């Protein structure tokens, strides 16, 4: 029965092994991508939550009718 | 209505709510949302009668007042500000204007009981289009503005939506209020997610417009407007029914279906924000929403109510008509789950 | 909006030219093959509608659903791939940006750590 | 007839098929979960001369 | 929601009339052209949150 | 509302019982006037004299509920020198309800009333304890 | 798993496919076949569980509760097969397709390795329920019966979700090898309290505990054979499985949270018993039965020792097996007389023997008679109750005697005293229903003569 | 009356048509063969085959290396006059107390 | 059996809860349909939201 239907105890030992490095990996980088929005919608100075400012090509530097702007 | 006039009506309106979700000043968006009105509303008077008269008043006078309170709230931050550009408005006062008036827009409680009015009142094609893109908009301008939102103001609003779509709908035994009232309850949930992630919001919101365009077709096609209508169905073609039981369970939010992914992202995220008491109740408070779900399906599909005798007739003769995409729609409505990480897509 | 605003996004722009460099999903992708089912079904249930044959009429409808879940799944992968790489690249980044925000701590043994125990009884 | 039992009985091979599937992608599901073969601390051992893994 | 139609085609609807530092007929300088120029400036391209700040 | 609840915020749980009544009377009563101002709106009275009277019912009650309420929760609170501990809280929410209950002269409404808003001030002090928000300010 | 998993997605096209009259044939034959594939799964190690893939793993606990699934599909489709004669081809292919997604969820619940694809699956077993129920059962109360059913099922499961989501943000992972690897103690607090109060009365109300049990009258009663079936045999387990999964994290606020639950779960167990010995419909009989035995299982998982996962392992085995067979004789009673009243049939013992014999067989397994897994079950609860507290055994002691006398007094009942004069339509009793009966006896007695193969990972 | 409903049918008895029934299906040769593939399918194979491979599973749960190992250590250890059983499961040279 | 299981167990958590639910049911949509009713609701929640909400 051994030798047709089952393998040995290292295939089971070395695959929960390397589950549960990649559970453990995907865990901290939860934990640590919650930090990372945490800081970028307290902060503002990362690529996410960048609300739209005005484009300053719009204004108009020709001189005036008005010399005081 | 000619045919002509039908189709550049039903052109302006979706003109208009594009011009709503291209334009970045204040007055054009405005300009898309009177538009938007303008054209819809002899498509709710296309069939004329008392009742659609009425239904396109009520509509008519709701859109206007919100539209008007809109532009108060564009002049009050122009005001403070001196700016036009859809942004994130530079005056509480004027915030608090504007999200009244998209809230009264969107039917939101307490602006909802033009909602269950105009949809009893019109057809299924005008409720259909109602409810789709009529939400479609103003939760585009929402999305926009979503950074200035009260969280304390959106948060009742949502919750009170949601309590009064579960016992409205509770109560009534017509199909369109039945679905005005969902479409409340399902509003409530989107808004309620907004002030957090306006991805979930614009994934509550299709996940929605895919149920609720999939039931407005099986309607049609069963021709259907009361639930008693809705109960000869079986005998004539009872795979109709079968499927509008699915997506009945669907629409309840239980699984595998796809009506769990907007609830279950959504509860999430709010969580992830430190809070529990709110996606608690709002998961509790959708039991209501289930439960005449489930009360429509016994009486649909579950069991088999009396028939006619001119049924037979019925039998003899065919289905002429087809409403394409209803097969999609069946099918993204309920069976779309394991390509939930497609949101991300969505972003 | 987490991602929206982003540095040099174009707008309606499904699928930038930087997705180019990430590995695009085998076509035997189960998430295609899934894409490929719900089409299959779509043309069962446009069958049951009409009142043809389910599983006989149709074949050339049924194949065209077919096709264009698949096709329209291909490029619904790629682009959430490519916002998932994007996502995890602007976070690493940031870690890298933030070190003190983000630092390496001590790490101690369970001999050294104390524990509590709560017996069973 | 072989066509008319063959029409009859050709769903009986639907399980079977399923099954051998099954049990292919089982083990191309474990082929993928080879990070620490012959890499534990307990059952780390040197290759004999005619093996190239120690499991499949 | 903003489906930036007229930035993806070079178009230009109402970012005219969006601020009043923009081109004005006859070169008419708005009454606030400076201050609005400056900030406009100061909170080009740092986003809503840094700019507020 | 914010001026009301801040006020009983500051007024300390086992201290000052007169003050805790008062500002629970008035956050009932504000409560009963906003009741009765909608229904007044979408059921209206055939009469103003009917009207006045079913706003004066509405705004009673709320206030006696109010009012019991903080009195039981400061009385139960000073009496077993033990504050911050939620049972106060179920005990006004008990006496509350059965205020509510002789209001509207019904034994069963009393009863499902005491339960679910002793339940409910429970939860109410659970929170303040813990630091449990509703309306959580957005992050992350 | 895949190779359990695809065959039944195979089985599905299969039913659909079949000729109208082979549909039976063919869903009974590769039923069997699937539960000697997967009688596989009993092959556990002593260290760890099986971890096949990323998503799916075996243990000592998930392997009997799947043999138990893969054996009792074919044993519905022969009940099914002997109620269902006059229903329409499409109509029996809808039946058996809603039971081949109640055992593919099962499958997939039970080797589920997250707690959230766990919840989903296990939340997704209520829609093939609900159908069966709501649309083959027989009476006026089956749409009442599905309400409360499902309603008391959601209830329960909501605030389990949002606990499972919340919990997925502060750890970082649902999986149930790192919750176990990385479990922290759970400070006494009332975020905590109110978090194991989500967990465990979610499983508690799918049990059910007492105080939470009426959805299980209404829908057991109410159901079809089909779905009494499994109803009781492995969708009271999902509970039990659950709160043995759960608890893990829960320490050491369970010492403290559980004296409520305990004690509503020994003197509901006393109740149950008692309204047993004065029932006046036979399934409502062994619906309050299975309350009891539950119970029971609820009373073990909480004063959670090594000692009493074991005998709530066995037990909820054995339960399954018993109750299965109870409800298939009881629904041969009815399928004779029309009629779900106790004493309206009697004599049955003169008037169908061998029927009779099976009658005091699943009697005998159903009270704790020795050797039986029953009885190896209930006699380790009893065991670890009494070290857990030393009047647990007049409580298990009562309970015990209650047990004894319902039954006997079913069996008396049913079988023994003089038949009843004007009931003529008894005829002999079928092949069919006599395979079943042997098919749902003969593994009880040879798991009794294979004991460690249903003690669990304790063992 | 309310309705044009058919009466209730009475109950048909599969021995009236098929003296020897099994109670599988109403055609005869149908429900012999449904009889022969659940009898010998279920009763032979399963039980049978599954039994005998549950009695002769391998002895995975190293009940057997378990013993063994244990006659080993207790052999050593009684050999030796080492305690049979350790009174610590780790070492107190390698567990750094808090002062 | 009748007392706890089929009386109170009964009332405590199914029929008091179905009742609540039906008795705001009926109060929510026992509405007249009467857009001066409801709009003078509009103008009382406009004000509560200018006032209450800061
Ligand atoms: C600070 C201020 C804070 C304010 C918070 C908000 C409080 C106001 C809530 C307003 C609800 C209005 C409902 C109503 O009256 O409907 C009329 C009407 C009811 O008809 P009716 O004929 O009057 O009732 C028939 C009964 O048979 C008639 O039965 P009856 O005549 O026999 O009388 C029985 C019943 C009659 O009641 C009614 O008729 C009202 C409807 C039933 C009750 C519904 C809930 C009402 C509010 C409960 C209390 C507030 C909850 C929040 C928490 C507050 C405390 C922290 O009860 C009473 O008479 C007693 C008064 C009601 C209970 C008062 C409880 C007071 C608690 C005091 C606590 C003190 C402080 C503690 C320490 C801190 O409803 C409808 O027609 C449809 C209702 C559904 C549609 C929505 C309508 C409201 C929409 C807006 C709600 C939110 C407004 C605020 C946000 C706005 C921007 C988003
Ligand atoms: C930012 C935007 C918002 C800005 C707001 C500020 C604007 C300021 C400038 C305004 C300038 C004027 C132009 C705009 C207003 C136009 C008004 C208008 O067109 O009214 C037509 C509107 C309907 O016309 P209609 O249908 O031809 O007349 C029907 C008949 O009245 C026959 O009716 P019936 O036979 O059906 O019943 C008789 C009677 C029956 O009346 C009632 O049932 C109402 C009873 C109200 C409560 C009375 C006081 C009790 C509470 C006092 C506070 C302390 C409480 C202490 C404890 C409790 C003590 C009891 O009336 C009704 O039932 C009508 C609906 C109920 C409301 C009527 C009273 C409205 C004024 C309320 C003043 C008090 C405010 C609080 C009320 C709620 C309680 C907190 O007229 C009324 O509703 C009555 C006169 C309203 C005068 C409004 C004056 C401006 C208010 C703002
Ligand atoms: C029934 C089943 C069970 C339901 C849940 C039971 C537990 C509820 C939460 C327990 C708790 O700690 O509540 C007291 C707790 C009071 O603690 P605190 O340390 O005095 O908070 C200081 C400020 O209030 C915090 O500063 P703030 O700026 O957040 O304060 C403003 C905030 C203040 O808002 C509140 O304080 C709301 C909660 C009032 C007490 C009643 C508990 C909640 C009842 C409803 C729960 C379900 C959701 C609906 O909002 C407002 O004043 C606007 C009105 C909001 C109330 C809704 C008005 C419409 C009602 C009709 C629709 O509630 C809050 O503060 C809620 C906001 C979160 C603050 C986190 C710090
Ligand atoms: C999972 C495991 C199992 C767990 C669950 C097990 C099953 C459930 C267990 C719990 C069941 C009881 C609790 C829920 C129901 C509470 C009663 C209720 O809602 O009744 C509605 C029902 C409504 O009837 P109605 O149509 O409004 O009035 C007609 C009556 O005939 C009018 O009657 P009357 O005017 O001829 O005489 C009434 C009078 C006379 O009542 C008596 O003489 C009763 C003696 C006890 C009074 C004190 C109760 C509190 C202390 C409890 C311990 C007492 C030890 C002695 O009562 C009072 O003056 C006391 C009022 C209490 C208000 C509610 C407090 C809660 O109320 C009554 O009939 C009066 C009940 C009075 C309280 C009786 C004791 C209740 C149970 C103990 C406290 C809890
Ligand atoms: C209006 C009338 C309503 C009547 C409702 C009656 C409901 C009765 C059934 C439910 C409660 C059962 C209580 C049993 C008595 C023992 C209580 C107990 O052990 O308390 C101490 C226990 C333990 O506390 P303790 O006293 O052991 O703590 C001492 C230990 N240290 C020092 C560490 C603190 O208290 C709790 O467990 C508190 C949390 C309870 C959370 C709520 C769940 C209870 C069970 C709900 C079942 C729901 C279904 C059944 C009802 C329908
Ligand atoms: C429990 C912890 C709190 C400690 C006690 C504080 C709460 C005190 C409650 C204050 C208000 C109660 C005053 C009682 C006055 C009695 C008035 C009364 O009779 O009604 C009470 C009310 C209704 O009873 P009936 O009107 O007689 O029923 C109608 C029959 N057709 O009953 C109750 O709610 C119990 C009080
Ligand atoms: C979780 C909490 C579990 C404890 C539940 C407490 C409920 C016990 C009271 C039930 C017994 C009282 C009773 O029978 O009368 C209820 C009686 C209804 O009349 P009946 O005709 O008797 O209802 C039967 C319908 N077939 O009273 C009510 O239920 C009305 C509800 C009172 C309103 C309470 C609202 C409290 C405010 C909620 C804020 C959150
Ligand atoms: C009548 C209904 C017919 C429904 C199916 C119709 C389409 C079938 C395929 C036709 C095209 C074949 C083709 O061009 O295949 C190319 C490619 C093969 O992949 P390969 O080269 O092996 O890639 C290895 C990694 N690069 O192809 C692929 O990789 C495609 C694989 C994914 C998409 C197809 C998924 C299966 C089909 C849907 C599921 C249901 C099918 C039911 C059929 C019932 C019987 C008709």
Same mark, same amino acid.
């Given at each position: 029965?051994?030798?047709?239907?089952?393998?040995?105890?290292?295939?089971?030992?070395?695959?929960?092994?390397?589950?549960?490095?990649?559970?453990?990996?995907?865990?901290?980088?939860?934990?640590?991508?919650?930090?990372?929005?945490?800081?970028?919608?307290?902060?503002?100075?990362?690529?996410?939550?960048?609300?739209?400012?005005?484009?300053?090509?719009?204004?108009?530097?020709?001189?005036?009718?008005?010399?005081?702007? | 209505?000619?045919?002509?006039?039908?189709?550049?009506?039903?052109?302006?309106?979706?003109?208009?709510?594009?011009?709503?979700?291209?334009?970045?000043?204040?007055?054009?968006? /405005?300009?898309?949302?009177?538009?938007?009105?303008?054209?819809?509303?002899?498509?709710?008077?296309?069939?004329?009668?008392?009742?659609?008269?009425?239904?396109?008043?009520?509509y008519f006078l709701t859109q206007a007042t919100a539209s008007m309170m809109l532009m108060m709230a564009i002049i009050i931050n122009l005001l403070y500000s001196g700016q036009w550009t859809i942004t994130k408005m530079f005056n509480p006062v004027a915030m608090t204007m504007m999200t009244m008036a998209l809230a009264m827009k969107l039917g939101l409680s307490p602006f909802h009981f033009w909602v269950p009015e105009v949809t009893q009142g019109i057809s299924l094609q005008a409720g259909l289009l109602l409810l789709t893109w009529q939400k479609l908009a103003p939760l585009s301008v929402l999305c926009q503005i979503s950074q200035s939102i009260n969280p304390n103001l959106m948060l009742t609003m949502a919750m009170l939506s949601i309590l009064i779509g579960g016992w409205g709908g509770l109560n009534q035994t017509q199909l369109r209020k039945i679905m005005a009232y969902s479409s409340?309850?399902?509003?409530? /949930?989107?808004?309620?997610?907004?002030? +957090?992630?306006?991805?979930?919001?614009?994934?509550?919101?299709?996940?929605?417009?895919?149920?609720?365009?999939?039931?407005?077709?099986?309607?049609?096609?069963?021709?259907?407007?009361?639930?008693?209508?809705?109960?000869?169905?079986?005998?004539?073609?009872?795979?109709?029914?079968?499927?509008?039981?699915?997506?009945?369970?669907?629409?309840?939010?239980?699984?595998?279906?796809?009506?769990?992914?907007?609830?279950?992202?959504?509860?999430?995220?709010?969580?992830?924000?430190?809070?529990?008491?709110?996606?608690?109740?709002?998961?509790?408070?959708?039991?209501?929403?289930?439960?005449?779900?489930?009360?429509?399906? +016994?009486?649909?599909?579950?069991?088999?109510?009396?028939?006619?005798?001119?049924?037979?007739?019925? /039998?003899?003769?065919?289905?002429?008509?087809?409403?394409?995409?209803?097969?999609?729609?069946?099918?993204?409505?309920?069976?779309?789950?394991?390509?939930?990480?497609?949101?991300?897509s969505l972003n | 909006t987490m991602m929206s605003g982003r540095p040099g996004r174009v707008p309606l722009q499904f699928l930038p030219n930087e997705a180019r460099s990430l590995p695009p999903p085998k076509l035997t992708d189960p998430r295609l093959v899934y894409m490929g089912f719900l089409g299959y079904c779509s043309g069962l249930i446009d069958n049951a509608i009409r009142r043809r044959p389910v599983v006989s009429a149709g074949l050339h409808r049924q194949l065209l659903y077919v096709t264009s879940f698949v096709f329209f799944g291909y490029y619904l992968l790629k682009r959430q791939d490519?916002?998932?790489?994007?996502?995890?690249?602007?976070?690493?980044?940031?870690?890298?940006?933030?070190?003190?925000?983000?630092?390496?701590?001590?790490?101690?043994?369970?001999?050294?750590?104390?524990?509590?125990?709560?017996?069973?009884? | 007839?072989?066509?008319?039992?063959?029409?009859?009985?050709?769903?009986?091979?639907?399980?079977?098929?399923?099954?051998?599937?099954?049990?292919?992608?089982?083990?191309?599901?474990?082929?993928?979960?080879?990070?620490?073969?012959?890499?534990?601390?307990?059952?780390?051992?040197?290759?004999?001369?005619?093996?190239?893994?120690?499991?499949? | 929601?903003?489906?930036?139609?007229?930035?993806?085609?070079?178009?230009?609807?109402?970012?005219?009339?969006?601020?009043?530092?923009?081109?004005?007929?006859?070169?008419?300088?708005?009454?606030?052209?400076?201050?609005?120029?400056?900030?406009?400036?100061?909170?080009?391209?740092?986003?809503?949150?840094?700019?507020?700040? | 509302?914010?001026?009301?609840?801040?006020?009983?915020?500051?007024?300390?749980?086992?201290?000052?019982?007169?003050?805790?009544?008062?500002?629970?009377?008035?956050?009932?009563?504000?409560?009963?006037?906003?009741?009765?101002?909608?229904?007044?709106?979408?059921?209206?009275?055939?009469?103003?004299?009917?009207?006045?009277?079913?706003?004066?019912?509405?705004?009673?009650?709320?206030?006696?509920?109010?009012?019991?309420?903080?009195?039981?929760?400061?009385?139960?609170?000073?009496?077993?020198?033990?504050?911050?501990?939620?049972?106060?809280?179920?005990?006004?929410?008990?006496?509350?309800?059965?205020?509510?209950?002789?209001?509207?002269?019904?034994?069963?409404?009393?009863?499902?009333?005491?339960?679910?808003?002793?339940?409910?001030?429970?939860?109410?002090?659970?929170?303040?304890?813990?630091?449990?928000?509703?309306?959580?300010?957005?992050?992350? | 798993?895949?190779?359990?998993?695809?065959?039944?997605?195979?089985?599905?096209?299969?039913?659909?496919?079949?000729?109208?009259?082979?549909?039976?044939?063919?869903?009974?034959?590769?039923?069997?076949?699937?539960?000697?594939?997967?009688?596989?799964?009993?092959?556990?190690?002593?260290?760890?569980?099986?971890?096949?893939?990323?998503?799916?793993? !075996?243990?000592?606990?998930?392997?009997?509760?799947?043999?138990?699934?893969?054996?009792?599909?074919?044993?519905?489709?022969?009940?099914?097969?002997?109620?269902?004669?006059?229903?329409?081809?499409?109509?029996?292919?809808?039946?058996?397709?809603?039971?081949?997604?109640?055992?593919?969820?099962?499958?997939?619940?039970?080797?589920?390795?997250?707690?959230?694809?766990?919840?989903?699956?296990?939340?997704?077993?209520?829609?093939?329920?609900?159908?069966?129920?709501?649309?083959?059962?027989?009476?006026?109360?089956?749409?009442?019966?599905?309400?409360?059913?499902?309603?008391?099922?959601?209830?329960?499961?909501?605030?389990?979700?949002?606990?499972?989501?919340?919990?997925?943000?502060?750890? %970082?992972?649902?999986?149930?090898?790192?919750?176990?690897?990385? !479990?922290?103690?759970?400070?006494?607090?009332?975020?905590?309290?109110?978090?194991?109060?989500?967990?465990?009365?979610?499983?508690?109300?799918?049990?059910?505990?007492? %105080?939470?049990?009426?959805?299980?009258?209404?829908?057991?009663?109410?159901?079809?054979?089909?779905?009494?079936?499994?109803?009781?045999?492995?969708?009271?387990?999902?509970?039990?499985?659950?709160?043995?999964?759960?608890?893990?994290?829960?320490?050491?606020?369970?010492?403290?949270?559980?004296?409520?639950?305990?004690?509503?779960?020994?003197?509901?167990?006393?109740?149950?018993?008692?309204?047993?010995?004065?029932?006046?419909?036979?399934?409502?009989?062994?619906?309050?039965?299975?309350?009891?035995?539950?119970?029971?299982?609820?009373?073990?998982?909480?004063?959670?020792?090594?000692?009493?996962?074991?005998?709530?392992?066995?037990?909820?085995?054995?339960?399954?097996?018993?109750?299965?067979?109870?409800?298939?004789?009881?629904?041969?009673?009815?399928?004779?007389?029309?009629?779900?009243?106790?004493?309206?049939?009697?004599?049955?013992?003169?008037?169908?023997?061998?029927?009779?014999?099976?009658?005091?067989?699943?009697?005998?397994?159903?009270?704790?008679?020795?050797? !039986?897994?029953?009885?190896?079950?209930?006699?380790?609860?009893?065991?670890?109750?009494?070290?857990?507290?030393?009047?647990?055994?007049?409580?298990?002691?009562?309970?015990?005697?209650?047990?004894?006398?319902?039954?006997?007094?079913?069996?008396?009942?049913?079988?023994?005293?003089?038949?009843?004069?004007?009931?003529?339509?008894?005829?002999? !009793?079928?092949?069919?229903?006599?395979?079943?009966?042997?098919?749902?006896?003969?593994?009880?007695?040879?798991?009794?003569?294979?004991?460690?193969?249903?003690?669990?990972?304790?063992? | 009356?309310?309705?044009?409903?058919?009466?209730?049918?009475?109950?048909?008895?599969?021995?009236?048509?098929?003296?020897?029934?099994?109670?599988?299906?109403?055609?005869?040769?149908?429900?012999?063969?449904?009889?022969?593939?659940?009898?010998?399918?279920?009763?032979?194979?399963?039980?049978?085959?599954?039994?005998?491979?549950?009695?002769?599973?391998?002895?995975?749960?190293?009940?057997?290396?378990?013993?063994?190992?244990?006659?080993?250590?207790?052999?050593?250890?009684?050999?030796?006059?080492?305690?049979?059983?350790?009174?610590?499961?780790?070492?107190?040279?390698?567990?750094?107390?808090?002062? | 059996?009748?007392?706890?299981?089929?009386?109170?167990?009964?009332?405590?958590?199914?029929?008091?809860?179905?009742?609540?639910?039906?008795?705001?049911?009926?109060?929510?949509?026992?509405?007249?349909?009467?857009?001066?009713?409801?709009?003078?609701?509009?103008?009382?929640?406009?004000?509560?939201?200018?006032?209450?909400?800061?």
């Open positions: 029965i051994a030798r047709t239907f089952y393998d040995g105890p290292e295939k089971n030992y070395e695959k929960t092994m390397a589950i549960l490095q990649i559970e453990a990996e995907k865990a901290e980088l939860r934990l640590k991508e919650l930090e990372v929005r945490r800081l970028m919608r307290a902060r503002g100075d990362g690529p996410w939550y960048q609300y739209p400012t005005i484009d300053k090509a719009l204004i108009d530097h020709s001189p005036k009718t008005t010399p005081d702007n | 209505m000619n045919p002509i006039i039908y189709t550049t009506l039903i052109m302006t309106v979706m003109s208009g709510t594009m011009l709503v979700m291209i334009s970045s000043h204040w007055l054009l968006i /405005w300009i898309g949302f009177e538009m938007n009105l303008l054209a819809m509303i002899p498509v709710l008077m296309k069939n004329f009668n008392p009742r659609a008269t009425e239904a396109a008043t009520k409340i309850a399902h509003m409530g /949930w989107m808004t309620a997610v907004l002030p +957090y992630n306006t991805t979930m919001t614009i994934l509550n919101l299709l996940i929605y417009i895919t149920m609720t365009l999939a039931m407005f077709m099986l309607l049609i096609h069963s021709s259907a407007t009361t639930t008693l209508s809705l109960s000869h169905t079986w005998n004539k073609m009872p795979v109709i029914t079968s499927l509008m039981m699915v997506t009945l369970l669907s629409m309840g939010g239980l699984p595998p279906l796809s009506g769990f992914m907007p609830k279950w992202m959504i509860i999430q995220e709010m969580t992830k924000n430190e809070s529990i008491i709110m996606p608690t109740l709002m998961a509790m408070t959708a039991l209501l929403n289930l439960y005449f779900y489930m009360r429509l399906a +016994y009486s649909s599909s579950l069991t088999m109510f009396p028939s006619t005798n001119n049924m037979k007739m019925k /039998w003899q003769f065919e289905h002429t008509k087809q409403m394409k995409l209803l097969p999609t729609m069946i099918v993204l409505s309920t069976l779309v789950l394991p390509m939930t990480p497609a949101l991300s | 490519y916002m998932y790489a994007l996502r995890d690249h602007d976070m690493f980044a940031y870690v890298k940006s933030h070190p003190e925000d983000f630092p390496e701590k001590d790490k101690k043994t369970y001999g050294e750590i104390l524990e509590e125990f709560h017996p069973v009884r | 007839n072989v066509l008319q039992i063959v029409r009859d009985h050709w769903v009986h091979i639907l399980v079977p098929v399923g099954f051998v599937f099954g049990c292919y992608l089982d083990r191309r599901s474990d082929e993928k979960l080879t990070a620490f073969r012959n890499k534990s601390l307990l059952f780390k051992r040197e290759l004999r001369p005619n093996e190239e893994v120690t499991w499949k | 929601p903003f489906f930036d139609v007229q930035k993806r085609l070079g178009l230009d609807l109402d970012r005219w009339m969006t601020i009043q530092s923009a081109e004005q007929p006859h070169k008419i300088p708005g009454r606030c052209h400076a201050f609005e120029k400056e900030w406009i400036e100061c909170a080009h391209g740092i986003g809503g949150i840094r700019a507020e700040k | 509302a914010k001026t009301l609840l801040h006020k009983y915020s500051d007024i300390p749980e086992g201290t000052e019982c007169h003050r805790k009544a008062y500002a629970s009377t008035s956050i009932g009563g504000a409560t009963g006037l906003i009741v009765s101002a909608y229904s007044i709106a979408l059921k209206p009275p055939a009469s103003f004299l009917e009207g006045v009277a079913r706003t004066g019912r509405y705004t009673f009650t709320s206030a006696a509920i109010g009012a019991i309420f903080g009195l039981t929760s400061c009385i139960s609170a000073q009496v077993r020198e033990k504050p911050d501990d939620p049972l106060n809280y179920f005990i006004g929410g008990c006496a509350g309800g059965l205020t509510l209950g002789a209001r509207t002269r019904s034994y069963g409404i009393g009863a499902a009333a005491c339960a679910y808003m002793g339940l409910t001030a429970a939860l109410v002090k659970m929170g303040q304890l813990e630091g449990w928000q509703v309306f959580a300010e957005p992050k992350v | 798993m895949l190779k359990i998993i695809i065959p039944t997605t195979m089985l599905l096209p299969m039913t659909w496919m079949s000729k109208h009259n082979m549909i039976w044939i063919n869903a009974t034959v590769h039923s069997l076949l699937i539960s000697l594939i997967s009688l596989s799964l009993l092959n556990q190690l002593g260290e760890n569980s099986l971890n096949f893939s990323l998503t799916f793993f !075996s243990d000592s606990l998930s392997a009997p509760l799947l043999v138990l699934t893969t054996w009792l599909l074919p044993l519905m489709l022969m009940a099914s097969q002997s109620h269902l004669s006059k229903e329409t081809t499409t109509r029996k292919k809808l039946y058996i397709t809603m039971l081949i997604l109640l055992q593919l969820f099962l499958i997939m619940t039970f080797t589920a390795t997250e707690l959230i694809l766990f919840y989903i699956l296990f939340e997704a077993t209520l829609v093939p329920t609900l159908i069966i129920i709501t649309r083959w059962g027989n009476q006026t109360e089956r749409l009442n019966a599905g309400l409360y059913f499902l309603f008391y099922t959601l209830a329960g499961s909501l605030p389990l979700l949002v606990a499972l989501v919340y919990i997925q943000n502060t750890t %970082g992972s649902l999986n149930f090898l790192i919750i176990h690897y990385w !479990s922290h103690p759970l400070s006494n607090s009332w975020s905590n309290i109110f978090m194991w109060l989500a967990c465990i009365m979610a499983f508690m109300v799918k049990m059910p505990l007492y %105080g939470l049990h009426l959805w299980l009258p209404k829908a057991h009663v109410e159901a079809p054979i089909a779905g009494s079936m499994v109803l009781a045999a492995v969708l009271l387990k999902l509970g039990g499985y659950g709160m043995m999964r759960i608890t893990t994290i829960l320490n050491p606020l369970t010492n403290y949270m559980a004296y409520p639950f305990l004690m509503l779960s020994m003197w509901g167990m006393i109740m149950t018993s008692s309204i047993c010995l004065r029932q006046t419909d036979l399934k409502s009989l062994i619906a309050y039965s299975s309350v009891s035995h539950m119970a029971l299982v609820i009373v073990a998982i909480m004063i959670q020792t090594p000692w009493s996962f074991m005998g709530a392992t066995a037990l909820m085995i054995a339960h399954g097996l018993t109750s299965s067979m109870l409800f298939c004789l009881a629904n041969t009673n009815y399928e004779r007389v029309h009629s779900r009243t106790m004493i309206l049939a009697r004599g049955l013992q003169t008037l169908l023997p061998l029927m009779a014999t099976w009658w005091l067989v699943a009697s005998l397994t159903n009270l704790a008679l020795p050797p !039986s897994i029953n009885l190896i079950g209930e006699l380790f609860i009893i065991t670890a109750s009494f070290s857990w507290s030393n009047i647990t055994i007049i409580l298990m002691g009562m309970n015990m005697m209650i047990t004894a006398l319902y039954s006997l007094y079913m069996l008396i009942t049913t079988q023994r005293g003089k038949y009843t004069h004007h009931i003529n339509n008894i005829k002999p !009793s079928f092949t069919r229903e006599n395979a079943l009966m042997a098919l749902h006896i003969l593994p009880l007695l040879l798991l009794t003569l294979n004991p460690k193969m249903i003690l669990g990972p304790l063992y | 009356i309310r309705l044009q409903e058919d009466p209730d049918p009475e109950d048909e008895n599969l021995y009236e048509k098929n003296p020897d029934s099994h109670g599988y299906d109403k055609d005869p040769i149908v429900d012999l063969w449904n009889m022969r593939v659940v009898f010998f399918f279920g009763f032979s194979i399963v039980l049978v085959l599954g039994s005998t491979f549950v009695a002769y599973l391998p002895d995975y749960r190293m009940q057997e290396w378990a013993r063994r190992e244990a006659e080993r250590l207790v052999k050593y250890r009684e050999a030796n006059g080492l305690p049979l059983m350790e009174s610590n499961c780790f070492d107190p040279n390698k567990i750094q107390l808090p002062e | 059996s009748s007392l706890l299981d089929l009386i109170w167990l009964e009332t405590i958590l199914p029929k008091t809860t179905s009742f609540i639910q039906m008795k705001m049911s009926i109060m929510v949509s026992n509405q007249k349909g009467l857009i001066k009713l409801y709009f003078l609701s509009f103008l009382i929640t406009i004000m509560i939201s200018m006032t209450l909400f800061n």
